[PDB]
Amino acid sequence: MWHYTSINNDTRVALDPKPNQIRTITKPNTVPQLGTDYLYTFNSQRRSHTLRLLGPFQYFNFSETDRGHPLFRLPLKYPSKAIPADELIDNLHSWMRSVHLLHVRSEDNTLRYNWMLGVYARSTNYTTPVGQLVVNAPAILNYSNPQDAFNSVFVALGIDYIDIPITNSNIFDDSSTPYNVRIWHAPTMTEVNHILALMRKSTLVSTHSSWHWNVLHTFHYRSESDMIDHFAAKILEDWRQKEKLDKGALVEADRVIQRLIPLSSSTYVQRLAAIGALYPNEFTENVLDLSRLSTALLQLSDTYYQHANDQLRRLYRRMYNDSRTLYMTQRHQELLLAQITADPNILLYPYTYIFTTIPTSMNYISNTGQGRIKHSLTVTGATEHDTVADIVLGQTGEDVITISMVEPMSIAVEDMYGYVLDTPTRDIWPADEQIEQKGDAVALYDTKTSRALGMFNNTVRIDDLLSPLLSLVYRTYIKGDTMTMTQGSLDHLTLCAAVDSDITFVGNRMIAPLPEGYIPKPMHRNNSTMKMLSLYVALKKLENFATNSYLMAPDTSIILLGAEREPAVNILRRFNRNVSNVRIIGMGDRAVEPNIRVRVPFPIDKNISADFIICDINSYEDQSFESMFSETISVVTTCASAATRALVKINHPSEYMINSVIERLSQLGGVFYHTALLKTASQNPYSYETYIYITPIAAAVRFPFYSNSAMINRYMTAVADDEMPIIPSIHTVIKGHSNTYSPGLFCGCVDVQSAPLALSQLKSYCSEATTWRVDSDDNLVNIIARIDPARIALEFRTRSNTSAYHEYQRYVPNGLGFKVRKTREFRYMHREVTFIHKLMMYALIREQISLTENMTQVVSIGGRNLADISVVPLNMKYVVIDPATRIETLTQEKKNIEVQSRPFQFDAANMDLENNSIYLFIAVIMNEPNGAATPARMQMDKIRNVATAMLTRTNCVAYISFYEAGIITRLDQSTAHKTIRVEEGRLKVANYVPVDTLVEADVTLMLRDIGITHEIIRPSTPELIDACSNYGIRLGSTGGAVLDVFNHYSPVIKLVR
């Protein structure tokens, strides 16, 4: 598709009306209409009005009388706001009525009326010789042949040319015109040549490659800057046109070479003409910034003036030394020849040269316009690096980047009110177990739990996490934008938690509109409010699970036993206004009214009872463990005695403490208390504090004691740290292949030229990196990129430093972002619970692996996209056996990583387990490679097969992850599981198919029958803290509730030989 197909035409001639049409050309009878007769726009930002007449009127000189019309006075009358369409239409209409162009209507169909000379003569009020010639003989304006229209008047006047002023396009500006267009009497090509050659000896003149009305016309500039801005706009036009032509589309090019040909100009114009005629690749790639076009054009010229390509440089130089010559590619020239063959006497510019376009392979990425780029850096590339120098990142203002401490949660309102259960497992509590658990509980309470865990608990507050969601409900209710919801709905409870004023539905599912002028104050919530609310919802769901309404039943009561102001009692009182007779009271030692101020145990005289109790008692004072123990025992006892459904808090949920609770409940006469541990989503994500749930039932409870409960493990496994908590640093100096970085994030700015290099260097650490420039003019490019431990574990396996730097240099300068808006990164980004559990399991397995001695290799079967790479040490060889893994032989060879790329056979004969090897089977055992779930008996079968297969080799360690059965019992009873599910009895993590679960006892019994050594470990609190500290991940609430029961029920079998 080489040859251009374009239909050339003199568009400016086609615009000139037939003489018969001039009388009604203003359409005197009817109002001018927008979008047809005019275009008005008010740019409120620049506060500039802009009118633009359409049709023949787009070229209209205005007489000073026309300027005196009120229409042109309008923008002054409305300095700040748009001219109303009424006034604009009426003024433009009456002014339009005022205009009248001298003309003689005729019968011959061949005539056209010379609109230019007509309106021009009118504007000068018929004073100039053309104006006189016209007012005396209007019939002179009619023309058959377009050129003779002017020859008639040059002959009539005897003048060699007419200097005709240009109209401004907007009719509101009255600015003095940058140039004017002279029109020469040059009937033949020879006259055109002589005039051009004379023009090439006179200041500030230029011209088009061809002329409308087939009559020569030159532009004459008042100043050099005007010549520059004109040349710029024309170059842009010819580049857009040539771009459209090269795509091969048919196009109505009014003239084949749109750009101007300087005849006499300053140097800078000659540079514009030169790069302009190059049709440089940079325009198609949008490498230039068009907002400041001529500047960019001047800049482009300079590079072409000293271009690395000899061809382009000699070509540009040549064009610069012969500026008067028009340069064109051959594909243009054929269009010129076609245009000549159609109309033999057409005039076009005599002095021309046909250069061959020089190909250039540099395919720049680019995109002007808003949007930061979110890079995904490759581990490796074609480029080799040798000892790249450290790259400092600049200081950045808060106007560009800010770093908030924690990412606020995004979540549906219902998800906040969920909770998880953990039922008792042990059938008995033997005394030796009591002494052991007491020793662990006392040793643990005596020295406070991990300082890092307490840091995350004290930074990831639930109040701040839920504030952006809660206030959003306030702002919507405040506008009246909120509407339908059920009476008992959780969205209703959130609405109660947003605003201090009582709300009331006008009828079913319709909240009352606010009284006029009223803007109720948002409800005041302390950190524990929403948690108390979710405990209320929890007690409601526990009383019966099917319910959707959460209103209290009529004639019932609830007590929020720990209290200060306790906003929750007020919100709840407000929630139940439509329900008759519902006692609701806080009852703390620090209680303010409405709540009664009272100590627990209750004074013997005082009578207290309720259908529900929600204790949140917690001693602020430091105290002995025996005192805290007796206090919590008296608290749970008094809470259980006083209600049919207690929901006690436990600040120190050791196994010994909870078992002491169940034993003490056992000691009370005549009531068998069913019980369960619990954790709501509105708790602070990291708090180990756990809500025990007591309730009488007629039967004695089988398996009443706890052991290895998840909620308890969350607390007990945390212990005083051997290291200070890892504070997230903000790095600036990017060393080339260093591996000295503490977890945190790179953040800063570089020159746009250095930017491809800097991205290529930080791919060593960061797995991805957002970048952007603030504006087209500012040359600094901001970059943010958090450090991925997994990418460090990948890139530092060998000393080679490959990167896609060649690809990154396609970005400079427009290809890597723009964003005027301030951006706000968080030190702790959100991540889904499955991903977090995966990272915790990786921390557990990695710390476990570093202890192991003398093993040649790690083999992660089912490794996907090297997901387990964080686990393996930089030394020992890594292997993957996921069929779905993509191959990268350069990356594999460079990074010491074999990839089997075939399904792994679990059958013992097929098995080929090496000596001195660590076999990871993380989460792969539960699925077939095609993604369909494998039945649990088949899972147990393949585990048994891996066991017997590794039974023979002397040194090996398998890690078979799987899902324990008990979790399905718990999620059947829980609520807060936006991710995890229980479809038809199978776990359904993420988007994965539901998959049947193993029971831990049968698996352990099988491994004991095999005779192999094993140890069913699961990751604990310190592992969680390591994953969060390293990856820069805050937990989030729903994940905070679900994570313990989820983590406990993904056991990791650790076969060892």
Partner 1 sequence: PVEYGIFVQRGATYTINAAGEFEFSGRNEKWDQALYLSEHFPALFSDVPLAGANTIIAIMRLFTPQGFLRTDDLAIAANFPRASRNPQTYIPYTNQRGTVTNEFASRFRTIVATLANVVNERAVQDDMQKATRSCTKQWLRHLETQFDNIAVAHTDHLSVVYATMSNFMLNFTNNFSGNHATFKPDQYVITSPEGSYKPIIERQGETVDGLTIIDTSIVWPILCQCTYPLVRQSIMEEIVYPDPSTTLSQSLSVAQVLSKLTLPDAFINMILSGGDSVVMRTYQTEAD
Q: 187-226 mask for partner 1 (x: CB under 8 A)?
A: --------------xxxxx----------------xxxxx
Q: 144-173 mask for ligand GTP (x: CB under 6 A)?
A: --------------------xxxx------
Within 330-441, strands assigned E span: 352-353, 373-375, 401-404, 419-422
C-alpha 419: how far from chain center: 30
Among positions 301, 632, 860, 870, the unique one binding ligand ATP when judged by CB under 6 A:
301
**Which of the listed partners (ligand ATP, a copy of itself, ligand GTP, none) does 201 bind, with a CB threshold of 5 to 8 Å by partner kind?**
none
Find the angle CA(792)-CA(794)-CA(799) to the nearest 5 degrees: 90
Shortest CA distance to 278 belongs to which of 252, 311, 312? 312
372 is an interface residue for a copy of itself by CB under 8 A: yes
79 is an interface residue for partner 1 by CB under 8 A: yes
Sites for a copy of itself among residues 805-824 (CB under 8 A):
807, 815, 817, 820
Residue nearest to ligand SAM (CB): 862
97 is an interface residue for partner 1 by CB under 8 A: yes
Percent composition of the chain: helix, strand, coil (DSSP 3-state, to 5) = 35, 15, 45
Cα→Cα distances 416→52, 491, 538, Å: 57, 10, 11
The nearest distance, CB 596 to a copy of itself, in angstroms, is 5
Mapping DSSP to helix (H, G, I), strand (E, B) and coil, where does residue 612 land?
strand
Shortest CA distance to 1045 belongs to which of 979, 966, 983, 942? 966
Sites for a copy of itself among residues 990-1029 (CB under 8 A):
991
C-alpha span between 898 and 776 (Å, rounded): 46
Question: Strand 505-507 to strand 510-511: parallel, antiparallel, or no bridges (unpaired)?
Answer: antiparallel
Ramachandran region, residue 27 (left: φ > 0; alpha: ψ -120 to 50; beta: rest): left
Sites for ligand ATP among residues 308-327 (CB under 6 A):
320
Q: Is 526 annotated to bind ligand?
A: yes
65 is an interface residue for partner 1 by CB under 8 A: yes
199 is an interface residue for ligand GTP by CB under 6 A: no
**Which of the listed partners (ligand SAM, a copy of itself, partner 1, none) does 881 bind, with a CB threshold of 5 to 8 Å by partner kind?**
ligand SAM
Within 501-645, strands assigned E span: 505-507, 510-511, 556-560, 582-586, 612-613
The window from 63-71, 139-147, 516-524, 630-638 that contacts partner 1 (CB under 8 A) reads 63-71
Cα→Cα distances 366→558, 812, 841, Å: 63, 8, 41
Question: Residue with structure tokens 């313990």?
Answer: 1044
Query: Do 710 and 745 contact (CB within 8 A), yes or no?
Result: no
Structure tokens at 54: 């359409």
Cα atoms in the 13 Å half-sphere on the side-chain side of 536: 31
The nearest distance, CB 680 to ligand SAM, in angstroms, is 12
**Which of the listed partners (ligand GTP, ligand SAM, ligand ATP, none) does 320 bind, with a CB threshold of 5 to 8 Å by partner kind?**
ligand ATP
**Which of the listed partners (ligand SAM, ligand ATP, a copy of itself, none) does 922 bind, with a CB threshold of 5 to 8 Å by partner kind?**
ligand SAM
Give Cβ neighbours of residue 318 (< 8 Å, ≥ 6 apart). Answer: none
Judged by beta carbon, residue 75 or residue 165, the one nearer ligand GTP is 165
**Which of the listed partners (ligand GTP, a copy of itself, ligand ATP, none) does 208 bind, with a CB threshold of 5 to 8 Å by partner kind?**
ligand GTP
302 is an interface residue for ligand ATP by CB under 6 A: yes
**Phi, psi dihedral angles at 230 (to 5 degrees):** -65, -50
The nearest distance, CB 312 to ligand ATP, in angstroms, is 12
84 is an interface residue for a copy of itself by CB under 8 A: no
**Which of the listed partners (ligand ATP, ligand SAM, partner 1, none) does 1003 bind, with a CB threshold of 5 to 8 Å by partner kind?**
none
Give the interface size with a copy of itself as a residue count (CB under 8 A): 128
Q: Is 286 annotated to bind ligand?
A: no
Among positions 103, 122, 208, 540, the unique one binding ligand GTP when judged by CB under 6 A:
208
993 is an interface residue for ligand GTP by CB under 6 A: no
**Which of the listed partners (ligand GTP, ligand SAM, a copy of itself, none) does 373 bind, with a CB threshold of 5 to 8 Å by partner kind?**
a copy of itself
Among positions 82, 135, 157, 633, the unique one binding partner 1 when judged by CB under 8 A:
135
The nearest distance, CB 166 to ligand GTP, in angstroms, is 4
489 is an interface residue for ligand GTP by CB under 6 A: no
Other beta carbons within 10 Å of 76: 9
Rg (CA), the chain: 41
C-alpha span between 559 and 563 (Å, rounded): 10
Cα atoms in the 13 Å half-sphere on the side-chain side of 653: 27
Shortest CA distance to 586 belongs to which of 606, 556, 562? 562
Among positions 82, 181, 726, 908, the unique one binding ligand GTP when judged by CB under 6 A:
181
Give the interface size with ligand ATP as a residue count (CB under 6 A): 6
Give Cβ neighbours of residue 267 (< 8 Å, ≥ 6 apart). Answer: none
Judged by beta carbon, residue 69 or residue 525, the one nearer ligand SAM is 525
Other beta carbons within 10 Å of 523: 20
3-state secondary structure 258-274: CCCEEEECCHHHHHHHH
Judged by beta carbon, residue 95 or residue 808, the one nearer ligand GTP is 95
Sites for ligand ATP among residues 233-272 (CB under 6 A):
267, 271
C-alpha span between 480 and 1016 (Å, rounded): 56
Cα→Cα distances 989→833, 998, 1041, 1042, Å: 10, 15, 15, 12
The window from 299-307, 340-348, 625-633, 920-928 that contacts ligand ATP (CB under 6 A) reads 299-307
Q: Is 599 annotated to bind ligand?
A: yes
The nearest distance, CB 334 to ligand GTP, in angstroms, is 22
What are the residues facing 217 on neighbouring strands? 183
C-alpha span between 88 and 215 (Å, rounded): 37
Within 567-625, strands assigned E span: 582-586, 612-613
The nearest distance, CB 178 to ligand GTP, in angstroms, is 10
**Which of the listed partners (ligand SAM, a copy of itself, ligand GTP, none) does 886 bind, with a CB threshold of 5 to 8 Å by partner kind?**
a copy of itself
C-alpha span between 875 and 799 (Å, rounded): 12
The nearest distance, CB 267 to ligand ATP, in angstroms, is 6
231 is an interface residue for ligand GTP by CB under 6 A: no
C-alpha span between 997 and 1000 (Å, rounded): 9
960 is an interface residue for partner 1 by CB under 8 A: no
762 is an interface residue for a copy of itself by CB under 8 A: no
Judged by beta carbon, residue 67 or residue 314, the one nearer partner 1 is 67
373 is an interface residue for a copy of itself by CB under 8 A: yes
What are the residues facing 183 on neighbouring strands? 162, 217
**Which of the listed partners (partner 1, a copy of itself, ligand SAM, none) does 770 bind, with a CB threshold of 5 to 8 Å by partner kind?**
a copy of itself
C-alpha 550: how far from chain center: 37
| Interface contacts to ligand ATP, rule CB under 6 A | 267, 271, 301-302, 305, 320
Return binding residues for S-adenosyl-L-homocysteine.
528, 563, 566, 589, 600, 619, 904, 992
Binding residues: 271, 302, 305, 526, 528, 562-564, 566, 589-590, 599-600, 619-620, 631, 838, 842, 864, 882, 904, 992
Give the residues lining the site for partner 1 (CB under 8 A). Answer: 45-48, 63-65, 67-68, 73, 75-76, 79, 94-95, 97-100, 102, 124-128, 132, 135, 163, 173-176, 178, 180, 201-205, 222-226, 228-229, 264, 268, 292, 294-295, 298
What residues line the site for ligand GTP (CB under 6 A)? 12, 59, 61, 115-116, 120, 164-167, 181, 208, 212
